[PDB]
Amino acid sequence: KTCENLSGTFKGPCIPDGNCNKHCRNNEHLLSGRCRDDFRCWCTNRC
């Protein structure tokens, strides 16, 4: 896969709404696009 980190508690947050995939995928259009803060999702893209 490509550069992926979990957005949330560990290694950088994002958004507390829980809509992870739609976030990284809609605005940034990543590969896994799993963006949250209060919640934890892995966004994947090429760094």
UniProtKB/Swiss-Prot annotation:
Single Gene Ontology BP annotation: killing of cells of another organism
Keyword annotations: Antimicrobial, Disulfide bond, Fungicide, Plant defense
Tissue expression per record: Epidermis and vascular bundles of pods, stems, roots, leaves and wet or dry seeds.
Covalent S-S links between cysteines: C3-C47, C14-C35, C20-C41, C24-C43
UniProt-listed Pfam families: Gamma-thionin (PF00304)
Family assignment from sequence similarity: Belongs to the DEFL family.
Species per Swiss-Prot/TrEMBL record: Pisum sativum
InterPro entries in the cross-refs: Defensin_plant (IPR008176), Scorpion_toxin-like (IPR003614), Scorpion_toxin-like_sf (IPR036574)
Entry-linked SMART domains: Knot1
PROSITE patterns: GAMMA_THIONIN
Identification of the protein by name: Defensin-2
Task of the protein: Possesses antifungal activity sensitive to inorganic cations.
